[PDB]
Amino acid sequence: MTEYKLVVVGACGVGKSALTIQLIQNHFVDEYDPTIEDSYRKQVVIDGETCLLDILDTAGQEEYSAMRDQYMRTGEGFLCVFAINNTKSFEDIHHYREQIKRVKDSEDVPMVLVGNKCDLPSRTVDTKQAQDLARSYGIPFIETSAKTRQGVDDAFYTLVREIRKHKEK
Numbered sequence: 001m002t003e004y005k006l007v008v009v010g011a012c013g014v015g016k017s018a019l020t021i022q023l024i025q026n027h028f029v030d031e032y033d034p035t036i037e038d039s040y041r042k043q044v045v046i047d048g049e050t051c052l053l054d055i056l057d058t059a060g061q062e063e064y065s066a067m068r069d070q071y072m073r074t075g076e077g078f079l080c081v082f083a084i085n086n087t088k089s090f091e092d093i094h095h096y097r098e099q100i101k102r103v104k105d106s107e108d109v110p111m112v113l114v115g116n117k118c119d120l121p122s123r124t125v126d127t128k129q130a131q132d133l134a135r136s137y138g139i140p141f142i143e144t145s146a147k148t149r150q151g152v153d154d155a156f157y158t159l160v161r162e163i164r165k166h167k168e169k
């Protein structure tokens, strides 16, 4: 019955939908419309706690900006995703970090930084660069592949653990 409201954000094409569908349905989707924004739910056990994950797979601009503000305010934790072969997507993390803090009007928002597509040979963002950014934010960094499932549970479960740490204070 404890529910965690998770929000997946990041530039178009980084694997937000693929990561979410891998977590929920345990398969890799080759093709999922980049413009579809939807929420998914699943019951999981995390550190012995049976809980419900309610995950919003975001798709960018909204019909009205109030819709963006609404999901950022109600969201409890944010998975900030870039792709390791797309430097622009890594640079865009700065924008998402700032915008979420701005809407929530808080310095302390549970977040995890995710470098997806680590199964690919092409890499433009080395691990050190991403670790340096995560260190500056004081948040965890996890490399994932939605295709092989590497790191997928860890990314989402770590985010839940970050929410728990925020709530106990």
Ligand SMILES: Nc1nc2c(ncn2[C@@H]2O[C@H](COP(=O)(O)OP(=O)(O)O)[C@@H](O)[C@H]2O)c(=O)[nH]1
Pocket (backbone or CB within 6 Å): 010, 011, 012, 013, 014, 015, 016, 017, 018, 019, 029, 030, 031, 032, 033, 034, 116, 117, 118, 119, 120, 144, 145, 146, 147, 148
């Ligand atoms: N090789 C590989 N491809 C991926 C991975 N994650 C996503 N993709 C592919 O990257 C493209 C964009 O993924 P998508 O989930 O639609 O990204 P979104 O726009 O962030 O929702 C799709 O063609 C996916 O098949 C991954 O971890 N490895």
Ligand SMILES: [Mg+2]
Pocket (backbone or CB within 6 Å): 016, 017, 018, 032, 033, 034, 035, 036, 057, 058, 059
């Ligand atoms: Mg998508």
